[PDB]
Enzyme design. Structure first.
Site, PDB file in Angstrom:
ATOM      1  N   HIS A 150       0.809  -1.220   0.000  1.00 41.81           N
ATOM      2  CA  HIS A 150       0.000   0.000   0.000  1.00 41.81           C
ATOM      3  C   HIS A 150       0.830   1.252   0.000  1.00 41.81           C
ATOM      4  CE1 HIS A 150      -3.273  -2.641   0.698  1.00 41.81           C
ATOM      5  NE2 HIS A 150      -2.912  -2.972   1.933  1.00 41.81           N
ATOM      6  N   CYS A 171       0.111   2.406  -4.604  1.00 49.23           N
ATOM      7  CA  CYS A 171      -0.666   3.542  -5.091  1.00 49.23           C
ATOM      8  C   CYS A 171      -0.057   4.882  -4.749  1.00 49.23           C
ATOM      9  CB  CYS A 171      -2.067   3.627  -4.448  1.00 49.23           C
ATOM     10  SG  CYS A 171      -2.947   2.027  -4.511  1.00 49.23           S
TER      11      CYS A 171
HETATM   12  C1  LIG Z   1      -1.993   1.332  -3.094  1.00 46.65           C
HETATM   13  C2  LIG Z   1      -2.722   0.235  -2.382  1.00 46.65           C
HETATM   14  O1  LIG Z   1      -3.167   0.460  -1.266  1.00 46.65           O
HETATM   15  C3  LIG Z   1      -3.252  -0.955  -3.191  1.00 46.65           C
HETATM   16  N1  LIG Z   1      -4.516  -0.371  -3.554  1.00 46.65           N
HETATM   17  C4  LIG Z   1      -2.510  -1.380  -4.483  1.00 46.65           C
HETATM   18  C5  LIG Z   1      -1.156  -1.984  -4.159  1.00 46.65           C
HETATM   19  C6  LIG Z   1      -0.566  -2.768  -5.331  1.00 46.65           C
HETATM   20  C7  LIG Z   1       0.796  -3.202  -4.797  1.00 46.65           C
HETATM   21  N2  LIG Z   1       1.689  -3.832  -5.792  1.00 46.65           N
END
Ligand SMILES: *CC(=O)[C@@H](N)CCCCN
Ligand SMILES: N[C@@H](Cc1c[nH]c[nH+]1)C(=O)O
Ligand SMILES: [Ca+2]
Ligand SMILES: [Ca+2]
Ligand code: NA
Ligand code: NA
Ligand code: NA
Ligand code: NI
Length: 452
Positions: A216, A249
């Site tokens: 994340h 993200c």
């Molecule tokens: C950014 C996040 O919280 C997720 N929504 C996507 C992470 C993808 C990691 N490779």
């Protein structure tokens, strides 16, 4: 397929189009000098020039025309360097992402594939731009007092109750099995596959060449294990600058109300990164998995090299191609595109990925892979004036450049026998000290002077 049709854009002689905010003219000088010294033909323009303008539409029209005019003369720019934050080069809202993108500066014809390797040296002041440049020059000129930090990497599969086991750990384990290991020269492969993550970011200070986090993200952090923009400002990796990749993200959402994570990690003085690859909108678990390892990877199953297509790790470690920071991001987007084309599980689509991922900092850097090798070369005692070319001995594939006062006079690539025909676009007509630079992917640079 996408690999045959849209391969690595790197070509010689290297040509780069620079579009910059006028406040950065002075701070850019040392970076432009070094790029010319290492063999880049530079075409440098500022937004105080009416032909460029200050709007998204005018800057884009300017860049597309420079690309098409260059292509018409079989002299297309390879790189596009955008110098400044969104107050000087705005970018535009992605058609798929709904978030800022630089894609449409680089995408000249009708498809979503860029024509040029594009990166943004995002800074809010000339001092911040100089911070980025100083890290880039130390890395590329290899002037760091301790090169052993280059033999080390940091790899983290961050927290997620459902996806750490399905995609995060398989991604990092693939990287370690085939490339980030002792067989490839890496002595310290700091890796965190699951909790506890305690002390995982201390390695950023002790020294790593590369830091890859997958899980994340937020506009100002790697979320868990947590690394905020406040923590980035407190890093102490003097003379140990890395490439960092956030497969997560929004860490590269560079039009955010605050400087984003990618901007801070490259802007911080004498610490942090020389370049950052990350996403402006959300990234997806499925496409990020293919981005790093290649298409045909299966969730919850450690992928094999023979069972997958070429991903970002694979491309990085090809010795003869995909040797720049931009090419690492390019290969990742190719794998995410290929996965969609062949019918793998996809969560968002290829067009979105080409709009999503960005390089912040210098995308034209050619990263080392563990300790770079020492090159072999023979330089003549002198260079006779008024010659169309010179023959300089260097290892096969080495790029030789002759310049003076940041003006590039000629370049050549060493043939199989170790001889480079340095074609002089500007013949040497005056006596003086001329710079000779020899570079090669995963080799220390040769930086010398020759008398005429
Ligand atoms: C950014 C996040 O919280 C997720 N929504 C996507 C992470 C993808 C990691 N490779
Ligand atoms: N050629 C040396 C390079 C090196 C690795 N570590 C320190 N120096 C060996 O291998
Ligand atoms: Ca295109
Ligand atoms: Ca910004
Ligand atoms: Na070791
Ligand atoms: Na692969
Ligand atoms: Na490579
Ligand atoms: Ni060593």
């Amino acid at each position: 397929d996408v690999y045959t049709d849209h391969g690595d854009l790197y070509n010689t002689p290297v040509r780069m189009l620079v579009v910059a905010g006028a406040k950065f003219k002075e701070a850019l000088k040392p970076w432009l000098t070094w790029k010319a010294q290492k063999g880049f033909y530079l075409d440098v323009h500022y937004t105080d020039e009416a032909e460029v303008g200050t709007t998204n539409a005018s800057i884009k029209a300017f860049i597309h025309k420079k690309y098409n005019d260059g292509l018409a003369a079989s002299a297309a720019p390879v790189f596009l360097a955008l110098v400044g934050d969104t107050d000087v080069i705005s970018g535009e809202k992605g058609k798929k992402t709904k978030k800022v993108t630089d894609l449409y500066y680089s995408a000249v014809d009708g498809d979503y594939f860029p024509e040029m390797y594009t990166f943004r040296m995002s800074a809010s002041s000339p001092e911040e731009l100089t911070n980025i440049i100083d890290k880039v020059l130390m890395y590329e000129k290899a002037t760091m007092p301790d090169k052993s930090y280059l033999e080390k990497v940091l790899l983290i599969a961050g927290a997620d109750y459902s996806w750490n086991s399905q995609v995060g750990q398989p991604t990092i384990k693939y990287g370690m099995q085939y490339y980030y290991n002792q067989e490839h020269g890496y002595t310290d492969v700091y890796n965190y596959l699951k909790a506890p993550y305690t002390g995982c970011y201390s390695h950023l200070n002790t020294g790593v060449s590369f830091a890859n986090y997958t899980a994340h993200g937020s506009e100002t952090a790697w979320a868990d294990p947590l690394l905020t923009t406040s923590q980035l400002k407190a890093l102490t990796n003097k003379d140990k600058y890395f490439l960092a990749i956030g497969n997560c993200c929004i860490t590269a959402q560079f039009d955010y109300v605050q400087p984003c994570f990618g901007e801070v990690i490259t802007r911080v003085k004498e610490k942090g990164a020389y370049a950052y690859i990350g996403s402006s909108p959300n990234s997806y678990w499925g496409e990020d998995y293919y981005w790093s390892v290649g298409a045909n990877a299966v969730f919850g199953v450690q992928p094999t090299f023979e069972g997958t297509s070429m991903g970002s790790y694979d491309a990085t470690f090809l010795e003869d191609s995909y040797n720049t920071v931009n090419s690492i991001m390019w290969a990742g987007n190719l794998a995410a595109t290929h996965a969609g084309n062949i019918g793998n599980i996809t969560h968002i689509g290829a067009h979105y990925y080409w709009e999503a991922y960005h390089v912040l900092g210098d995308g034209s850097v050619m990263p080392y892979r563990a300790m770079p090798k020492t090159n072999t070369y023979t330089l003549p005692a002198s260079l006779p004036q008024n010659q169309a070319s010179y023959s300089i001995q260097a290892s096969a594939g080495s790029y030789v450049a002759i310049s003076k006062d940041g003006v590039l006079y000629g370049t050549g690539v060493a043939n199989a026998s170790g001889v480079a025909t340095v074609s002089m676009t500007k013949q040497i007509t005056e006596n003086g000290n001329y710079d000779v630079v020899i570079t090669r992917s995963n080799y220390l640079p040769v930086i010398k002077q020759i008398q005429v």
